[PDB]
Symmetry: C2
Subunit: 204 residues, 2 copies
């Protein structure tokens, strides 16, 4: 029973990094524009591509479209993939994220990737990064990263900076730990249901 | 800016490990007895002593006594201590823990150790382990959630890991093993970290 066991990260593909980016909102929600979220979006796009991810961004989806998209991604095959990354950059009321027109419960989004529902991701890391102005990991191998101006937000800037230097070498949670320190110096948080060490060594 | 930076762990003392152990409850709460929580309590007592902690156990405190105790511990000096550990073994409705007679919000308990309120713990790890049938209060907080007569799976497996690897491994990687151990049983626990540095318990001088 090896205390230095790492997740298997030598599949054909790294996997998908889903980015839902929300800048403006339906007028009757009365939510302020999120200035520099697009900078965050692009920054995350660079960093994650560099780590081998197929990055798919969507901007300002309405609830229906977002659920369609995420449900779709939950149902393609991840059998030849290492892991899955999903990012939300929007407003958040409670355990909800905002789409363009309405709230969605985070649990209903994350639950799409639990084992009973997404077989090809079983025993692989499922990483959610949630940057929102609450929800425990959906199950085994889930990692939730919470953040708790025109050039981006502190959390995404510092996460991306760390991904840039250390992403290819460090264990991912120790890298988040650095992000905690970085941000604090200028507090964010991760919650882990991971079962092994996670690294993003460059692929063959 | 060193990515391998560890917390300073060479103070005079390791620190206190507070254990609030709850087995029976006031009748009108209608909460079932927690069988084998005493086993858990004793198991945690061994492991934490072995790691250099001054362990103080309290059994079935009523809300007033619990608050008094924890507020007291939050107000002694930790200046010559490495860190602080506090364990709750009780029932939990929401972000509440149960004392003997009532609920208490976990935030009001953790909040006592935030920097603005407990100066001698600033920049030191504050670890809460909650085993109950809330996000970290601030920097350097680590929350461990478990989410029969010989103990619970979570405490057994956490204690077994503390015993083998506690003196050696980085504490979060140790918790990760506990996630794997508990998962193997034929539930999935969790930790949430606001730690800023690597945490080790290496035997003290």
């Amino acid at each position: 029973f090896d205390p230095a066991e790492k997740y298997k990260m030598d599949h054909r593909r790294r996997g998908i990094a889903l980015i839902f980016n929300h800048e403006r909102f339906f007028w009757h929600l009365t939510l302020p524009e999120r200035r520099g979220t697009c900078a965050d979006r692009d920054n995350l796009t660079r960093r994650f591509s560099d780590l081998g991810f197929e990055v798919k961004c969507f901007n300002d989806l309405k609830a229906e479209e977002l659920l369609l998209k995420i449900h779709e991604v939950s149902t393609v095959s991840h059998a030849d993939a290492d892991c899955f990354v999903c990012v939300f950059l929007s407003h958040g009321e409670g355990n909800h994220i905002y789409a363009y027109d309405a709230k969605i419960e985070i649990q209903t989004l994350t639950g799409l990737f639990k084992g009973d529902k997404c077989h090809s991701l079983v025993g692989k890391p499922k990483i959610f990064i949630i940057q929102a102005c609450y929800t425990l990991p959906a199950g085994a191998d889930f990692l939730m990263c919470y953040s708790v101006t025109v050039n981006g937000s502190w959390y995404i800037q510092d996460l991306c900076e760390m991904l840039g230097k250390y992403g290819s070498s460090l264990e991912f949670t120790e890298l988040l730990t650095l992000v905690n320190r970085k941000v604090e110096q200028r507090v964010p948080c991760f919650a882990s249901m991971l079962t092994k060490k996670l690294h993003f060594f460059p692929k063959s």
